Design a binder for this molecule. Structure first.
Ligand SMILES: [Mn+2]
Ligand SMILES: [Zn+2]
Length: 206
C-alpha cells in the first residue's frame, strides 16, 4: 500500500486535474486485474500514468503476447496500491472519454465509483489507431514497458504482429484521431517516477 506521505503526494498531484476538462482513460489488462492505467487531459497535457502487478500470471502471459507486450519482470518494482488510491481520489461525477467502455465501466463500478461517467468514442478499430506510428515516433520515450512482440488475430484468418498497446500512448493517439492531427499540447506526467516505481538499485559508479 501507499505510505502516508505518498498518499498525500498522490492526492496533491491529482488535484492538478481540471475536474471539468476532457479526460481520456485507458487501461491494459482485465478490469479485475489491470496492469497499466492512464488518465490524460489533452487541453492541459497532464496525465496520470502508472502500472500494477497482475494477480493472474497465466492470463497476464496471454495478454502480454496479444495486446500490451509487457514483461512480468518489469513490473516487479512498481509501487503497489496505486490503482485503488487513484480511482478513490478522482473528482466526483467526472466524465471520462475512452475507446471501448465495457471493461473500464466494470473497473470503476467494482471500486464503487458508479458516479464516474464514461463516454465511449467507439471509433472503428483502424480509425482509432490512424496516428499510432506518429504517436510512437514522438512519444515512445514516455513509456518503456512494452518490450515483447505482440500478435493479434486477423478477422479474415491467421495472425499478424501489431504495435504493442500502451494505455498512455493509446490515450494520446485516440485524441490525435479525434482532432485529425497529432497536434496536442505537450503531455506531462503528474505523478513522480518515485511514486510510480519503488526505489530501484543505486546508480553504478562508472
Ligand atoms: Mn489500450
Ligand atoms: Zn505503456
Amino acid at each position: 500500500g501507499l505510505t502516508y506521505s505518498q498518499t498525500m503526494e498522490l492526492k496533491d498531484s491529482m488535484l492538478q486535474l481540471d475536474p471539468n476538462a476532457k479526460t481520456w482513460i485507458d487501461i491494459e489488462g482485465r478490469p479485475e486485474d489491470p496492469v497499466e492505467i492512464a488518465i490524460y487531459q489533452p487541453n492541459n497535457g497532464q496525465y496520470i500514468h502508472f502500472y500494477r502487478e497482475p494477480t493472474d500470471i497465466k492470463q497476464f502471459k496471454q495478454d502480454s503476447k496479444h495486446s500490451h507486450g509487457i514483461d512480468i519482470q518489469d513490473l516487479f518494482s512498481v509501487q503497489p496500491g496505486l490503482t485503488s488510491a487513484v480511482i478513490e481520489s478522482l473528482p466526483k461525477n467526472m466524465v471520462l472519454s475512452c475507446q471501448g467502455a465495457d471493461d473500464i465501466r466494470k473497473l470503476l463500478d467494482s471500486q464503487n465509483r458508479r458516479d464516474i461517467k464514461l463516454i465511449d468514442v467507439s471509433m472503428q478499430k483502424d480509425d482509432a489507431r490512424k496516428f499510432e506510428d506518429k504517436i510512437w515516433d514522438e512519444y515512445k520515450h514516455l513509456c518503456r514497458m512494452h518490450t515483447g512482440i505482440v500478435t493479434q488475430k486477423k478477422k479474415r484468418g491467421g495472425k499478424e504482429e501489431v504495435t504493442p498497446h500502451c494505455a498512455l500512448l493509446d490515450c494520446l493517439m485516440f485524441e490525435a484521431a479525434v482532432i485529425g492531427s497529432p497536434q496536442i499540447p505537450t503531455p506531462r506526467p503528474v505523478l513522480s517516477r518515485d511514486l510510480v516505481f519503488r526505489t530501484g538499485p543505486p546508480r553504478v559508479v562508472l
